[PDB]
Design a protein around this ligand. Structure first.
Ligand SMILES: [Zn+2]
Ligand SMILES: [Zn+2]
Ligand SMILES: [Zn+2]
Lengths: 57, 121, 790, 124, 108, 326, 69, 196, 57, 49
């Protein structure tokens, strides 16, 4: 779980050659499903996503 | 059964009783030398350049709307100046009630808020 | 620059601190502050200017008496030689151990040893027993070993007390070990904070339960929770019965007793009917509703008790009826026992020398009761933080401890009675007999306290004025650190109010703002019942010196109660800690409240401490019963807010706050409205709630849920793990500092217990295996160490 | 002495007995032995009335200056939103939101059809 | 507005007693006042006696530390007032009749 | 409905369809006429004057204006007088006697007045348990289910004085209906009563008007274009007399057992179906009448109203099935 | 606890970079993002590993059961 | 989750019409002139009367709620979808709501426009005996915000006052499942055992 | 991201045959000792509802 | 129907209590049973079956 009450159960350990990969050539550590958001409205996670990437950069 | 250190008040000084005259009770701070004053208002007053407030606490000592609801009874020197009698005026021995009770007490001026320093964008 | 606080990783500062634990003081004072209600209250048992709560309590117990029955041989109603037993002085040693015989001199024991041996961390409890033959004629003293008393970590009876971080590490403790818990059989237990009724204030109660004491009973009552210097309390209740009667109800030895209120009045002082009348009615004599009940009350006491005309006679009456209930000795007159009932039970906060103060107060209650019945004032809500206070673990420990000493003194007497009935040869003046008697008495008080800490079971002969018998202690679960810290900031009302099928005790209320966190409560069944304080909320552990407040009050125009007979909501009754000082108008009452506040915060008036609660309650139309209630006691919820006339910190409680205009931000301050503003809104949240990033952008249940998840994560239970023998530990191997952080995360030293990691997260539908809140972890990420734990 | 229906002794402070319960023709203070002629304490009246809120009723409520009832119109529970009513086909419905069961699941939305009155909930 | 102070008495002259509302005492009744000089504060004790009642009174130790009391005689056909210092005593009336009534040490 | 088959349900109701010639104003009035009305509802204020041959109370009742309470409750000044004359005074004297009694029957002072661990689990901790559990049966019943399973006047005054214990005068505002006043004289020795309050209590019990079993009748909005009134309470026969306003042939009820008693088993069967369906319709749950008919046919299999409890089960021909039930 | 060997996402060795990164912040007085760049950590994947590492081990190491404190 | 600049203007313009709404509603429930000042002695006396009585407070709450709710519907009706930066089908948040995949128009609007009135069991937000709903509001405030009308939206965040009130609303359903839960199990057993 | 500890005794189980209880000769309760899985009253009713008498048998 | 033994111990179940313990023999071991040839597991989603 992220720090926004978005708790999830590991369904697969997905092979990295099988993951999606970015223009930056990175594969995601974790996938969370967009359908996990519109009912919970944890908009603070979306903010954390930008802030964290900008911080790492 | 006199307690330790008290002596009977021997020679009691005089108390001239009687639009007629009125009898008041007044509270002053214990630190105030009453023996040297002049003024007195009928709000605010200053005594020795320090400022106080006079309050009409009559409705606490008694009732404003109804008679005989007085907490206090006045005791004046009797016909010997060696004891006290209940002060009366009614030619009925109906005890005197205080016409007014005043409290001279301390006052403080609380600073106004400085909204310039305090209400900041 | 010279700005507002932006975020920092503090990489060098942190890593150096890891390597070089400070040799002077901990770097995270906020963390020590959070555990203060526990350490403080425990310390109160032995500190204070008066020997501490234990010594106060043992003084309150007094003597236990027995006679030997011997003759003298004369005419006589002699009962034999008298034995008076009491405890004179209590003491608690730090945990030592004389490894074996010769009492091979003592050596200190540190808690790590207790953890590793899986036993208890305990100090020797010593009682100075006074054994008095014939009222002083010959009295024996002996100090008794009453067992190993579990000691609170980091308290004034723990060996870690006053240790720098460096020294803690050298003694195998966590670098910033908070303490506040006990170690019992290797298990870390804490006494959790309870919410109880605010001290020494007569609440107006409307409660259905009151109607079921009889068909005559109405649902109107007055309830006051008086507490003694030793912190034990005694609750008094007034009931209004429909036929006009007003009964006084108290509790003793787990039974309830009823006495007509007029009888308790006429037993406190010499008094006349008119005096009682003036005390309740005051000037409001055209109030038909009032004068009628008062005639009922007075005429009813006469005609039920026509032979009681004296104050002495009334005391004798009570003494006769209660001498069995109160276990009086055969030498105690009816007159004495009467006084004893008053001292032990009636408005106990005002003390033995305050019979005149109990009188005025009891009158005040009766009027407020009549005020409630008439609808003149509204009832006080006991479920609102406004009328609550917090029973602390150390205080509770003290209360139970006082009871065990009381049982202890009774056991001695019990043993001597057995000797007497068996015909055994008894000489109270012989020390060999005193020691033979004590040999047969269970002196292991320490282990009884251990039982309490171990099981959470309250075992006592009075209910300690609490509504339940269990759930008092709990394991300080160390699942991770976030859960650990939470334990010490948790407060509930008790299992009693949990089975009750209303919502009101569970609702989040305005009167909690700044005191309880609006986020950090569990879902499921304890929802709303288990709460956590806001992180900046403090709890008083001492009584502030209010000895000089009466003179300040008098100088501000308060009419002294000793010569002022007033009553009812037409004017402002002025009280300090449940003692009536006098009377003023409402207008002046407000000015006094405001003046007192200004002077308090200015800090230049001696005898007037910042933390004084100024409970001014204005007149209103059918609102709360008015008056000026000042408090300076133990167990108070207090929080910092910013006072605008000066620009200083003020301290504020939940009782006063209800009428206070406190702006949330400096921008929102209105003229002629706000007197204070918050330091920052973050003051109203708990620790965990404060750590959730961008919480003001999540729907509330998510922020609520995060507090639950954070306490359930595999993180860092601690770092001194190799000296521990815990039942179960979970450990994340590699944590990271969060890039997105609350600044308070640094202030609570949270990097010392990494609780998670910075993942690269994609919000994508792609695998097909991630619907219904299922998630995906990268297989190579996993294989490279991501999230590994033990 | 007299405070309507209660008479206190002048000497000590005690409440004198109610004359009409004393066998003699005088009343004596059982406290200080003061004597009071029965003819002095006659036919004193007390007037009690029922409290304003004693008899709640449709009529008593109209005696109030503020609104004590709602008409049929103002009864619109909640805001309105575009959401086809499954029953009648209507475009608007009124709605409310709650969290049910646990703090883990998504919000529950309660709908009430604006025209046809059909009510339903949704967890999706 | 303004009031002139003719005289101010510093010596024991009159006293003030709070008994209760509507309080009076029989015609004859007479009260003996007593005074002790404790620090720079004046303590007072009152004792009165009539045929079947006693009267006692004390000065409140706590209030007299910060309150001073003064009785005033006012002349409204003048702007004048006459002040006399007076103690305020907390007082009770005791019935000689029932004062010493008492039950047995114990009804055993 | 299904578990207790109660004769005494918590909120019994009849629904009365009204004719078309009955306008909306006439309906509203009609509601007022069959609704229960307490004496307190028409009283504005009571003033009591007490004095001290004996101890006397003058009780003066000030009602709201005649036009106002007629309009509001459909109550006539005659009806109002009638209740005070008969059942009110009786009750008041009754209450008084009982209180005088109490003044003679003596507190006695020194005599005394004679799993939470799992309740502390959050929803995660609780589900950790439930997730592993292999249930023996359905859920055990909750605490609820366990608990369950001036000469016309001069003479009228004397008539009243001779039928009561303490009244010495009695008068009613026969002209304008704004007041009632009477005087109670109690024995001289009697110690003081809170008479105004005793009177308050009796007022809230005195019944001006009431149809047996009916409380309030109400006029709700025409649901589905069915113009209808709704009563708190059930009394079919009383409604049978209002043939002038309501179509008696279309009266329906909440109360399965009432319908059974008055209209028979087939009627009761239908009422069960509709009532169970009403339960689910309110939560927008759809359940086939095919199931409902079966459940209701079962419940009425003996011509009666049988619940699915011990009693209904007790009839079953199978002893092994009973043995495995309770 | 101790520096991870590889970046969780990149696969890129990162464990040789902790001691130097500290020396960069300390000695050369650089900011964090400049120092990360100088060690060759380009992808935010990899910058994250060193930027947010907590050398918790240095705490664990202070409790050594095999030496007389 | 973004509105266009055009849309954000629409939103704040309609929101500015809620400014007086609470006071208009107070004047209506207290039966005073529509233009009565918010600090008018009589208005405050009548509000205090309202505060003491559960039924009356109920009315004040229902009427005020109805008005502010109309404002809420205006904002949403105007901004979603016409004021959104991304439109369906590219806007995944909208697409999930419309297609029935996940969420609802309600949820989208609380993210993009405003939370709305916080409602507790039909009433609004509790009021202390002093007549204040929070330490920061004066006694008998008529601002809709002081009664838990939240103009903030999850996208741009909510004020501390709104946050606190919104905690109340969130906790409500959870408290209700804890206390007002009826079980249906015993009923099912008894039906099946007889109908088996 | 936070990794949540297991709170539950998750571990699966399978039984073909195994230890039975002395009185009923029915599969013991166990997992750690090859206990059987319970078909309780609710599952009985479901099996009757299907009309599947052999599955019930 | 037996006189409580040696005030303490708690009674030993008789035949009635054996048949009626908890839900009772009938419900716990006849209307429902533990069975052979079955398994239990946590479930996980799969779109590919
Ligand atoms: Zn007398
Ligand atoms: Zn529709
Ligand atoms: Zn990387």
């Amino acid at each position: 779980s992220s720090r926004h009450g978005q708790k999830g159960v590991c369904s697969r350990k997905w092979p990295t050659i099988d993951m999606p990969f970015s223009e930056t050539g990175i594969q995601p550590d974790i996938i969370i499903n967009p359908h996990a958001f519109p009912s919970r409205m944890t908009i603070g996670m979306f903010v954390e996503s930008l802030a964290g990437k900008a911080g790492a950069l | 059964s006199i307690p330790d250190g008290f002596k009977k008040c021997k020679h009691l000084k005089n108390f001239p009783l009687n639009k007629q005259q009125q009898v008041w009770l007044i509270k002053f701070p214990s630190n105030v030398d009453i023996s040297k004053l002049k003024s007195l208002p009928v709000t605010t007053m200053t005594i020795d350049k320090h400022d106080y407030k006079i309050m009409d606490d009559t409705d606490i000592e008694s009732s404003l709307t109804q008679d005989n609801l007085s907490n206090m009874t006045l005791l004046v020197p009797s016909e010997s100046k060696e004891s006290l009698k209940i002060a009366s005026t009614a030619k009925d021995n109906a005890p005197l009630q205080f016409d007014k009770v005043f409290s001279v007490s301390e006052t403080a001026k609380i600073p106004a808020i400085d909204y310039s320093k305090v209400r900041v964008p | 620059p010279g700005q507002a606080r932006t975020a920092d990783f503090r990489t060098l500062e942190r890593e150096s601190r890891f390597i070089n634990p400070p040799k002077d003081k901990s770097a995270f004072p906020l963390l020590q502050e959070a555990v203060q209600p526990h350490i403080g209250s425990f310390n109160a048992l032995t500190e204070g200017p008066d020997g501490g709560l234990l010594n106060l309590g043992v003084k309150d117990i007094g003597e236990k008496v027995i006679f030997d029955g011997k003759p003298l041989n004369s005419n006589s109603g002699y009962l034999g030689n008298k034995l008076s037993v009491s405890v004179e002085q209590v003491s608690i040693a730090k945990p030592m151990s004389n490894d074996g015989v010769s009492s091979a001199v003592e050596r200190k024991v540190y808690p790590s040893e207790s953890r590793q041996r899986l036993t208890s961390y305990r100090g020797k409890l010593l009682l100075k027993l006074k054994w008095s033959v014939n009222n002083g004629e010959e009295n024996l003293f002996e100090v008794r070993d009453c067992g190993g008393l579990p000691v609170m970590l980091q308290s004034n009876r723990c060996h870690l007390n006053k240790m720098s971080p460096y020294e803690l590490v050298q003694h195998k403790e966590e670098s910033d070990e908070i303490g506040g818990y006990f170690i019992v059989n290797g298990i870390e237990k804490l006494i959790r904070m309870l919410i109880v009724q605010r001290r020494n204030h007569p609440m107006a109660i409307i409660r259905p339960s009151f109607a079921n004491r009889g068909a005559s009973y109405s649902h109107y009552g007055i309830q006051i929770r008086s507490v003694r210097p030793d912190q034990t309390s005694q609750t008094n209740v007034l009931h209004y019965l429909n036929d006009g009667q007003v009964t006084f109800r108290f509790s003793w030895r787990k039974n309830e007793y009823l006495v007509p209120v007029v009888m308790i009045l006429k037993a406190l002082c010499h008094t006349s009917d008119r005096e009682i009348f003036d005390g309740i009615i005051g000037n409001d004599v055209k109030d038909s509703f009032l004068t009628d009940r008062l005639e009922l009350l007075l005429r009813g006491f006469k005609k039920r008790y026509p032979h009681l005309q004296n104050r002495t006679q009334v005391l004798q009456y009570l003494g006769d009826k209660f001498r069995v209930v109160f276990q009086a000795s055969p030498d105690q007159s009816d007159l004495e026992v009467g006084q004893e009932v008053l001292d032990r039970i009636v408005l106990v906060h005002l003390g033995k020398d305050g019979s005149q103060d109990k009188f005025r107060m009891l009158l005040f209650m009766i009027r407020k009761l009549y005020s409630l019945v008439a609808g003149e004032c509204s009832p006080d809500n006991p479920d609102a933080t406004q009328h609550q206070e917090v029973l602390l673990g150390g205080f509770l420990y003290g209360m139970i401890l006082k009871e065990k000493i009381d049982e202890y003194l009774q056991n001695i007497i019990a043993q001597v009675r057995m000797d007497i009935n068996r015909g055994m040869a008894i000489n109270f003046k012989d020390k060999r007999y005193m020691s033979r008697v004590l040999m047969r008495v269970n002196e292991n008080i320490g282990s009884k306290m251990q039982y309490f800490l171990s099981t959470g079971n309250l075992v006592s002969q009075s209910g300690l004025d609490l509504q339940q018998v269990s759930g008092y202690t709990v394991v300080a679960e160390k699942i991770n650190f976030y859960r650990f810290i939470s334990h010490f900031r948790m407060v509930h009302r008790g299992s009693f109010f949990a089975q009750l099928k209303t919502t009101t005790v569970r609702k989040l209320l305005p009167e909690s703002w700044g005191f309880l966190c609006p986020v950090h409560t569990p879902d499921g069944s304890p929802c709303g019942l288990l709460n956590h304080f806001a992180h900046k909320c403090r709890i008083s552990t001492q009584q502030s010196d209010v000895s000089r407040i009466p003179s300040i009050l008098y100088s501000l125009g308060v009419a002294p109660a000793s010569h002022t007979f007033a009553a009812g909501p037409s004017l402002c009754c002025v009280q300090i800690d449940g003692k009536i000082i006098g009377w003023v108008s409402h207008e002046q009452g407000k000015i006094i409240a405001d003046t007192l506040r200004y002077w308090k915060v200015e800090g230049k008036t001696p005898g007037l401490p910042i933390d004084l609660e100024i409970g001014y309650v204005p007149p209103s139309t059918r609102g709360q019963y008015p008056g000026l209630y000042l408090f300076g006691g133990h167990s108070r919820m207090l929080r910092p807010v910013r006072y605008l006339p000066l620009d200083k910190e003020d301290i504020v409680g939940p009782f006063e706050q209800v009428y206070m205009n406190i702006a949330v931000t400096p921008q929102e301050i209105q003229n002629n409205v706000h007197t204070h503003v918050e330091f920052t809104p973050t003051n109203i949240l708990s620790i965990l709630a404060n750590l959730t990033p961008f919480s003001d952008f999540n729907q509330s249940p998510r922020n609520m849920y995060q507090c639950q998840m954070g306490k359930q994560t595999m993180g860092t239970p601690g770092v001194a793990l190799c000296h521990r023998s815990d039942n179960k530990l979970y450990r994340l191997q590699t944590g990271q500092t969060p890039i997105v952080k609350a600044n308070l995360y640094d202030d609570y030293g949270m990097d010392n217990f990494p609780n998670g990691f910075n993942a690269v997260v994609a919000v994508i539908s792609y695998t097909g295996y991630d619907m219904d809140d299922a998630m995906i972890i990268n297989k190579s990420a996993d294989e490279r160490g991501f999230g590994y734990g033990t | 002495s007299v405070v309507g229906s209660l008479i206190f002794c002048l000497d000590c402070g005690d409440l004198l007995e109610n004359p009409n319960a004393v066998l003699g023709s005088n009343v004596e203070c059982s406290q200080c032995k003061a004597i009071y002629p029965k003819s002095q304490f006659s036919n004193l009246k007390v007037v009690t009335t029922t409290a304003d809120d004693a008899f709640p009723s449709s009529l008593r409520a109209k005696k109030s200056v503020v609104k004590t009832s709602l008409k049929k119109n103002e009864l619109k529970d909640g805001a309105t939103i575009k959401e086809k009513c499954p029953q009648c086909g209507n475009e608007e419905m009124n709605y409310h939101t709650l969290q049910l069961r646990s703090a883990d699941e998504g919000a529950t939305v309660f709908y009430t059809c604006t025209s046809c009155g059909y009510k339903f909930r949704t967890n999706n | 507005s303004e009031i002139e102070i003719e005289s101010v008495q510093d010596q024991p002259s009159v006293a003030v007693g709070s008994f209760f509302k509507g309080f009076r005492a029989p015609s004859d009744t007479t009260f003996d006042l007593y005074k002790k000089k404790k620090s720079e504060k004046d303590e007072f004790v009152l004792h009165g006696e009539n045929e079947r009642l006693e009267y006692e009174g004390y000065t409140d130790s706590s209030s007299q530390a910060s309150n001073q009391y003064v009785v005033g005689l006012f002349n409204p056909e003048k702007k004048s007032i006459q002040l006399y210092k007076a103690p305020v005593l907390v007082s009770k009336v005791v019935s000689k009749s029932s004062k010493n009534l008492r039950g047995p040490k114990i009804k055993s | 409905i299904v578990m207790t088959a109660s004769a005494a349900i918590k909120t019994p109701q009849m629904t009365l369809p009204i004719w078309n010639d009955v306008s909306d104003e006439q309906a509203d009035t009609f509601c007022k006429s069959i609704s229960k009305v307490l004496l307190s509802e028409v009283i504005d204020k009571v003033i009591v004057t007490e004095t001290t041959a004996a101890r006397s109370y003058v009780i003066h009742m000030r009602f709201f204006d005649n036009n106002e309470y007629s309009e509001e409750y459909d109550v006539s000044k005659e009806e109002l007088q009638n209740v005070i004359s008969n059942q009110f005074i009786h009750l008041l004297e009754a209450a008084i006697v009982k209180e005088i009694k109490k003044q003679k029957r003596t507190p006695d002072i020194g005599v005394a007045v004679p799993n939470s661990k799992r309740l502390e689990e959050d929803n995660d901790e609780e589900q950790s348990h439930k997730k592993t559990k292999q249930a023996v049966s359905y859920d055990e019943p909750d605490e609820d289910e366990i608990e369950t399973m001036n000469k016309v006047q001069r003479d009228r005054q004397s008539a009243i004085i001779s039928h009561h214990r303490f009244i010495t005068k009695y008068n009613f505002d026969d002209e304008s209906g704004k007041w009632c006043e009477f005087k109670l004289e109690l024995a001289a020795d009697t110690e003081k009563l809170l008479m105004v309050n005793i009177v308050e209590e009796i007022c809230r019990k005195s019944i001006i008007r009431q149809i047996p079993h009916i409380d309030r009748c109400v006029h709700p909005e025409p649901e589905n274009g069915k113009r209808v009134l709704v009563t708190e309470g059930v009394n079919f026969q009383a409604m049978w007399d209002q043939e002038a306003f309501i179509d008696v042939d279309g009266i329906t009820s909440n109360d399965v057992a009432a319908v059974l008693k008055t209209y028979g088993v087939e009627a009761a069967r239908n009422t069960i179906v509709n009532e169970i369906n009403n339960v689910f319709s309110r939560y927008a749950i759809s359940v086939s009448f095919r199931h409902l008919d079966l459940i209701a046919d079962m419940m009425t299999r003996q011509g009666t109203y049988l619940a699915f409890n011990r009693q209904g089960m007790e009839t079953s021909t199978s002893s092994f099935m009973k043995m495995s039930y309770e | 606890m101790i520096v991870p060997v590889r970046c969780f996402s990149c696969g890129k060795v990162v464990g040789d970079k902790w001691e130097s990164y500290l020396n960069l912040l300390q000695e050369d007085e650089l900011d964090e993002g400049t120092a990360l760049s100088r060690l060759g950590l380009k992808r935010y994947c990899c910058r994250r590993m060193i930027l947010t590492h907590v050398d918790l081990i240095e705490k664990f190491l202070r409790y050594n059961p095999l030496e007389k404190r | 989750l973004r509105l266009t600049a055009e849309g954000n203007k629409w939103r704040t313009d309609i929101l500015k019409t809620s400014v007086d709404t609470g006071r208009e509603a107070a004047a209506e429930v207290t039966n005073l002139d529509k233009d009565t000042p918010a600090d008018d002695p009589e208005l405050l006396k009548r509000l205090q009367e309202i505060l003491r009585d559960n039924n009356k407070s109920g009315i004040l709450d229902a009427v005020t709620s109805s008005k502010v709710n109309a404002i809420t519907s205006q904002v949403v009706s105007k901004c979603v979808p016409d004021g959104t930066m991304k439109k369906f089908p590219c806007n995944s948040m909208q697409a999930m709501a419309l297609s029935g995949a996940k969420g609802s128009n309600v949820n989208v609007s609380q993210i993009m426009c405003l939370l709305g009135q916080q409602a507790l069991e039909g009433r609004r937000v509790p009021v202390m005996v002093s007549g204040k709903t929070l330490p920061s509001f004066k006694p008998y405030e008529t601002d809709a915000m002081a009664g838990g009308y939240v103009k903030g939206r999850f996208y741009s965040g909510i004020k501390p006052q709104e946050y606190y009130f919104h905690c109340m609303a969130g906790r409500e359903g959870l408290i209700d499942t804890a206390v007002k839960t009826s079980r249906s199990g015993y009923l099912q057993r008894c039906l099946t055992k007889q109908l088996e | 991201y936070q990794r949540l500890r297991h709170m539950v005794n998750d571990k699966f189980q399978v039984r073909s045959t195994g230890p039975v209880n002395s009185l009923t000769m029915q599969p013991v309760k166990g997992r750690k000792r090859h206990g059987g899985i319970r078909v309780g009253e609710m599952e009985r009713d479901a099996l009757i509802g299907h009309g599947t008498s052999f599955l019930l048998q | 129907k037996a006189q409580g033994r040696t005030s303490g111990k708690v009674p030993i179940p008789g035949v009635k209590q054996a048949l009626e313990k908890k839900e009772g023999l009938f419900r716990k071991h006849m209307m429902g049973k533990r069975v052979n040839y079955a398994a239990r597991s946590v479930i996980s989603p799969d779109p590919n079956i």
